[PDB]
């Protein structure tokens, strides 16, 4: 029943939001296949008679000719601005193709939207990129990015919601209006954004919901007279959203949303979420500018993540070189010579326990668990086959790890690729962390049709059995130590065979 | 030595500024004038000699001096907004920085043509430009759209993407030229065009503009600051006189205006977005900053797609690497012998036409292989460096005895296991005859007379021999992965042999 949250066909809602008009048409002659029901009020045209008719009937001859010229022999990926005044109401036109048919969306521009101009709100664009490149911290990047986005959009709340591996996400940047609830640092259940929503947003990197009280406007005819199926509004900005999400936004107290998908290597790294207490529409030009800001944000995040990884590598290079020098001139087994100086090995990874296993002898330094427990863990670790392994919560993946979770809640293990059972394990003790959640972690939904949770208060969750995160430099140091041990061990076996 | 004189001039201390602006180096607290450019005798009509030890209120007015004082007070001078002033009826754009405990303020003179140009329309397609940059799937597309946008905003006839090489010389990879204008696409340029001093300066200052090449430098009076009795360091000053040799070089090219943005990748001068105009024309500082931001985005996207290409090569070589690893694991012989069991797969792993496998006084050659003695001499030379892997596209350049077999093996990709036993795998690529294009005389960078830039700018063919096809990033990745697999398998075999 929880999994029902990821079963709705969001790609085929059969309706569009009332803030615009939709026209799915045949490509060559621009004959109308289906039209949204909103044309009974806007432009005053009956949607039933608008079947198998050219765009000239409703949109006028000149605008239809312009659309025909634009869509002819074009990939529809570099279409310029298209603003039309159709019976005195202004529309911004976007073109794409769903299934061998031309889908055209007319976003209705109100007087407030017309007053807003793309020049002044994007005048500080170059200064914003200069600040982005000049920022030396990720927090500075987030702060200036959400500040600029709030400046152009004008929304009360702007969030940077980064997703985790399991699905749930965390807010890391917050820019809120006065007397407005703060979600900085709060974790949210994965049910807020289902797998279907994430999959859709991996392709469409821009979504806007001006109002949460809107009544969806159905598409007539519902079935296309081409394949007798439902129109795929996957890349359509004029797509009705699930009513559960509207109720969720109402429960949060916001009535307008605007999200830009952040993509890093084809994965939904995070979302630039936005929130307004009152309905308000954002022009498509500003939305595209925010999308470009999001792509630049992802690029700079990747750049500084690589910078941090290289900084950790540089600060661990000296320790790695010292350990390599000790290993090369020990004349004993590689891990024995490594264990000759235990404190240096400890500070190489910053762990409080060292366990070195070499063919039925295990040596423990510092805060070390029971040797039998470490042996059982080690024989479990070789089953995966990975040369190195890092785990910040051993009890989560290793059920018998709860007994010694107070002593060893973080395990960083690395072993040489030889039949002899050998390896090096670093243990980090548990740190008691009160993770902050927005609402009930154990009650994501008010089971009644699914209903979003009404309560949005901060809950403390004392998450036990989790140690300090292993940094990228930590696993880099483990891998470099493994490589040095490989080289030195090969040298020793070759020399021993020679002599 | 005399050629090295190209990298000895003190460009950071020219002692003069270009006439298209005004310079004011001042004391920080009271904004008292330390030195002022000599151009104030014509602009604003002030004697530069009497303007010593005087506040900015004397020349710049009370309100503008107060604004500058407020801006420079308790500020890092890295986020200063626009500063436009109308000083005795002529407009200036003000830039602030600090050289040595003193406030350096540059007033770029904005002409009527510059005033007519607005930052809105020329940057209206900014978001579309970034969308095109991110949507481009090829480096050539990136270069094309980048130079197209930069030419659109700047209006210059020629725009070049000049990427530097390791040795200093660079190559143009993007070209956007006006009709009836000479093309430099694909041409190589000698390293003497941009000396080491210029590269070092541009590594810090990522924006340079020279509106005119016939300008007479305007000296700074007093020449020596009455603080340390030294010369003012105009390293980060846009109003800095350039070397006359560079002006003569630009005149020889036929251009009278230049505009370059430094491209930085990991703290290194990857390349320059060079520009060229046949007539003098000034570009406002706002458009120059926008072009600088475009250059930084260009570098970021270049790095992104370079990583993408490296990962694509890794992916397309993963299957071959896995097959070779499977063959290595179940051979029961020596690692390189089992590797040599299938020579064609090893060849197509790196796309080389010669394979040489060395294992303890036996060398096995497959395909186009040199003389075994030559390969042995090369191999004993290779272990001297100590690098686990080595890639060379021109062996004769670094290995003098490699000219004998340059027709057969001009590219060497070698990888060896870290053991006392002399073992290794070498891949040989044959020489490909390439006619490198140079702009002018490669053997005569300068017309030795003071150094004089070369007058001739015609295309010269240079048949560069002894150079094989470049080893790709995927090539060295495959070599390193093969080395790692050989390391793991060899350790397993020695451990098993010791056990039994
Ligand atoms: C089990 C079903 C539920 C549900 C489904 C659902 N939700 C969306 C859309 C979104 N939900 C979002 C979540 C947040 N908005 C915020 O402001 C914050 C944090 C402060 C969170 C975690 C977001 C960002 C979206 C995207 C839309 C937007 O607001 O821009 C969908 C997708 C609907 C569609 O695209 O048509 C679905 C199916 N959400 C729940 O919470 C439960 C009740
Ligand atoms: C041995 C001395 C010489 C000399 C010195 C020199 N040159 C510069 C400045 C530049 N030279 C550049 C070269 C090019 N411009 C182009 O258009 C092309 C290709 C089509 C090339 C290779 C460039 C780009 C610069 C930077 C300035 C600019 O044009 O934007 C300096 C630096 C002077 C200063 O910064 O004050 C110096 C010392 N150049 C020679 O060719 C010889 C004669």
Residue numbers in the entry:
A (entry chain A): 12 to 459, 466 to 516
B (entry chain B): 11 to 459, 466 to 516
Publication excerpt:
Phytochromes (Phys) are a divergent cohort of bili-proteins that detect light through reversible interconversion between dark-adapted Pr and photoactivated Pfr states. Here, we present models of both states for a dimeric Phy with histidine kinase (HK) activity from the proteobacterium Pseudomonas syringae, which were built from high-resolution cryo-EM maps (2.8–3.4-Å) of the photosensory module (PSM) and its following signaling (S) helix together with lower resolution maps for the downstream output region augmented by RoseTTAFold and AlphaFold structural predictions. Pr/Pfr comparisons show that bilin phototransformation alters PSM architecture culminating in a scissoring motion of the paired S-helices linking the PSMs to the HK bidomains that ends in reorientation of the paired catalytic ATPase modules relative to the phosphoacceptor histidines. This action apparently primes autophosphorylation enroute to phosphotransfer to the cognate DNA-binding response regulator AlgB which drives quorum-sensing behavior through transient association with the photoreceptor.
From PsBphP1 preparations dissolved in a HEPES-NaOH (pH 7.5) buffer containing 175 mM KSCN, we generated cryo-EM maps of Pr and Pfr using either dark-adapted samples containing solely Pr or samples irradiated to steady state levels of Pfr (~80% of total Phy pool) with red light immediately before freezing. The combined averages then generated an EM density map of the PSM at 2.9-Å resolution which was further improved to 2.8-Å resolution through symmetry expansion and local refinement of 1,666,098 matching protomers. The resulting data allowed construction of a head-to-head dimeric model encompassing residues 12-459 and 466-516 of protomer A and residues 11-459 and 466-516 of protomer B. While this 3D map provided high resolution for the PSMs, the HK bidomains and much of the S-helices were poorly visible probably due to high mobility. BV was covalently linked via a thioether linkage to Cys16 within the NTE. As expected from other homodimeric Pr models, BV in both protomers assumed a ZZZssa configuration, and was fixed within the GAF domain pocket by an extensive network of conserved amino acid contacts to all four pyrrole rings and the B- and C-ring propionates. Besides the covalent connection, the PAS and GAF domains were tightly linked non-covalently via hydrophobic interactions within the figure-of-eight knot created by a lasso loop extending from the GAF domain to tether the N-terminal extension (NTE) projecting from the PAS domain, which was further solidified by a noncovalent contact involving Ile27 at the knot center. The GAF and PHY domains in PsBphP1 as Pr were linked covalently via the intervening helical spine and noncovalently through the hairpin extension from the PHY domain contacting the GAF domain near the chromophore.
